[PDB]
Every structure is written in C-alpha cells, then in structure tokens.
Amino acid sequence: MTEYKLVVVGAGGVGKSALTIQLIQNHFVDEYDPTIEDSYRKQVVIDGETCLLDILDTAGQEEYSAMRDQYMRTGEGFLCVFAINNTKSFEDIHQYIEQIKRVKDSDDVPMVLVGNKCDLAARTVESRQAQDLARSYGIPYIETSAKTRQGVEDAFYTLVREIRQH
Ligand SMILES: Nc1nc2c(ncn2[C@@H]2O[C@H](COP(=O)(O)OP(=O)(O)NP(=O)(O)O)[C@@H](O)[C@H]2O)c(=O)[nH]1
Ligand SMILES: [Ca+2]
C-alpha cells in the first residue's frame, strides 16, 4: 500500500479545511474556524490501487507562516488553493508556489492549482487567468466547490497521480 503525503496550502478562508473535510468526511463545513495545522488520513482506491492519503490541513493566517518551511519539506505533493471570489488569494498563491519550489529546490514539485468556491457567482478570477498561471508551472488547474463537492475528488486525486507519476 503506497502512502501519499498531500499538503493543502493557500490564503486564509479560501476553503482548504472545507475542501479536505469534504473529501475525507463527505460534508460541508459552513462555519469559519481558522486552522493552525491539522492532519487527516484515509484509505482510498485510486486507479485500481489501494493507497493511504495523508493530508495536512495548513494555516492560511499569516501569523503561522513560520511553520510553513517544515511542512513544505515533508510534503510530497501540494494542493495550491485560491478562491475565485478573492483576487488577493490568487495573487497570493503565486507566492506559495515559489516558496515551495524554493524550500524544495525543485521546479518539478508535484502540485495542482485549485480554484475553489466555484459555486459562487461573485467571480473575480476568470478561469483563463488561473489556466495561464498553471501553464507556466506545468501543473494542472482544476476548479472545485467544497460546498457542492464539484471537482473535489478530481482535484485531490489528480494530485496523487502527479505524485505517483513523479
Ligand atoms: N460557497 C462556498 N463556501 C466555501 C467553500 N469552501 C469554503 N467555504 C466557506 O468559506 C469559509 C472558510 O472556509 P475554510 O475552509 O475554513 O477556509 P480555510 O482556507 O481552511 N481557512 P484557514 O486558512 O484560516 O484555515 C467557511 O465559511 C466555509 O464554509 C466553497 O467551495 N464554496
Ligand atoms: Ca455543515
């Protein structure tokens, strides 16, 4: 059984915890409790193979930026999340990737760029704008809603594939 170490990263309130919790636990967290750092673990079959997903729910608040370095070393693949109604989080996520590539000293780090909250109509990040950013990194772009589960399995499982195809 292969184990995959996924880390979910991005700015505060973009839906990292709701995305993780929707995948692992199949419900939507409506309330907003900022995360320090939580861990989840779950046995899944992906492309015929049983594997263990280890998922680190990280902090979006800047006050815990200090602990980013240590989880960027451990993690095998990184789900890079912004909210399509939050232009600042799209600008920010660009920064998170550069930090990962730095900390890991590779421009070949398994990653998926995720535009979350795609159920909201207050979109200020157009899909083409995120596509352009993903293209420059060689990584997939996938839109999701943690509310409706749209794209949630696809996003996380794409990241496993990126890691396992690394
Ligand atoms: N409509 C909608 N709301 C969402 C979605 N994902 C998260 N939210 C909402 O946005 C708020 C913040 O979500 P949360 O997952 O806690 O964000 P976070 O990125 O983990 N924040 P932190 O970095 O502080 O831990 C919550 O009220 C949650 O219900 C989504 O896909 N759609
Ligand atoms: Ca709920």
Ligand SMILES: [Mg+2]
């Ligand atoms: Mg959270």
Ligand SMILES: [Mg+2]
């Ligand atoms: Mg615009």
